[PDB]
Every structure is written in C-alpha cells, then in structure tokens.
Amino acid sequence: VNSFSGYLKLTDNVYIKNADIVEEAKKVKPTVVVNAANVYLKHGGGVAGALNKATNNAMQVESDDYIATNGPLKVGGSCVLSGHNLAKHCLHVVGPNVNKGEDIQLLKSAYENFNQHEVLLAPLLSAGIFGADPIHSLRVCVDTVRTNVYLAVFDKNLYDKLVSSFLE
Numbered sequence: 001v002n003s004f005s006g007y008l009k010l011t012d013n014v015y016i017k018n019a020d021i022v023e024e025a026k027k028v029k030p031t032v033v034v035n036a037a038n039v040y041l042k043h044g045g046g047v048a049g050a051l052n053k054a055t056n057n058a059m060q061v062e063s064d065d066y067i068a069t070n071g072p073l074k075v076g077g078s079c080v081l082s083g084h085n086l087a088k089h090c091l092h093v094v095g096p097n098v099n100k101g102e103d104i105q106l107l108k109s110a111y112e113n114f115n116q117h118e119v120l121l122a123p124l125l126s127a128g129i130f131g132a133d134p135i136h137s138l139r140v141c142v143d144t145v146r147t148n149v150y151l152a153v154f155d156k157n158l159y160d161k162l163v164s165s166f167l168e
C-alpha cells in the first residue's frame with residue numbers, strides 16, 4: 001500500500017525518518033524494501049540480520065537457493081527476491097564495505113539500483129559497520145536516485161546530524 005508517514009522531505013524524491021527499517025516495513029507494507037546485503041547474501045547481523053529475523057529465516061533460505069543457482073553478486077550490484085511478510089519484493093543491494101578495503105566509488109553503482117523501482121523503503125547504504133561517512137552516503141543518494149526513496153535511519157543522533165548537514 002506504500003503508506004509512509006512521519007518523513008522529513010529532503011528533495012522532491014528523497015525522504016528521511018528516524019526509525020527501524022523492520023518496523024517501517026510492517027507499518028508501511030511497501031512494494032520494495034531494500035536490504036544492505038553482502039555478495040553471498042549472508043544476513044548475519046545489522047540491517048540484514050534484522051530483516052532476516054523479521055521473516056523468521058525465510059529470507060536466508062531463499063537467499064541461499066538464489067546463490068546456489070546464480071553465484072554471488074558483485075559490489076555495487078543487486079538482485080530482486082521475495083519480500084516475504086515485509087514487502088512485495090526485497091531488493092538486496094551490495095554497497096562497498098570501506099572497512100574491508102572496498103572502493104567508495106561503488107556507492108554510486110549501489111544507489112543506481114534504486115532507479116529500477118518507482119518507490120522503495122531503504123537504509124543508508126554503506127553506513128554503520130561498512131565504514132562509509134554517512135553524510136557522504138546521503139549526498140550520493142540525493143544525487144543518484146531519481147525515483148521515490150524513503151530512508152529509515154535507526155539512530156536519532158545520526159538522523160539530526162544528517163538533516164542539519166543537508167540543510168546547511
């Protein structure tokens with residue numbers, strides 16, 4: 001149904017909210033939920049682990065079957081799989097993990113995958129344990145995504161920092 005509520009409008013197509021992406025998916029029922037995935041689709045922690053746990057491991061089992069037939073993704077790449085109880089579809093997107101020596105330029109490639117879907121609920125790619133500067137990740141999102149993107153950022157301190165930096 002895509003009923004998003006409580007979002008701050010940053011640009012004509014980019015919205016942001018201090019929220020847990022799992023709680024937003026349950027409330028919104030979006031057509032597309034974005035997962036901050038790794039190349040083998042192993043959802044062992046962070047945003048991916050939270051989404052997987054909310055599908056009671058159904059997402060991991062489907063992900064394993066996809067990798068068996070198609071092999072791993074590339075950094076900056078994506079795949080569309082079932083959204084299970086959270087969404088119609090899950091778009092698994094691999095942003096670079098600069099904490100593992102991956103190239104930050106690939107974050108543009110990662111956000112470009114959003115352009116194939118008219119409206120998506122997403123996290124801030126490559127932020128948290130992936131090591132990218134969150135302010136930079138929001139700027140790449142604003143400059144690269146043209147479709148309607150609702151960003152859920154589960155940290156009030158980071159949310160206010162991103163909003164102040166964007167309004168500067």
Ligand SMILES: CC(C)[C@H](Nc1ncnc2[nH]c(-c3cnn(CC(N)=O)c3)cc12)c1ccc2c(c1)S(=O)(=O)CCC2
Binds near residue numbers: 128152153155158
């Ligand atoms: C910047 C950070 C605040 C943000 N976190 C999140 N942003 C939005 N929705 C979230 N839900 C949870 C969560 C964590 N636990 N639970 C309960 C559960 N049952 O697991 C829900 C965390 C989360 C963030 C954004 C991007 C990435 C990561 C973290 S990561 O996982 O460290 C590496 C991949 C890229």
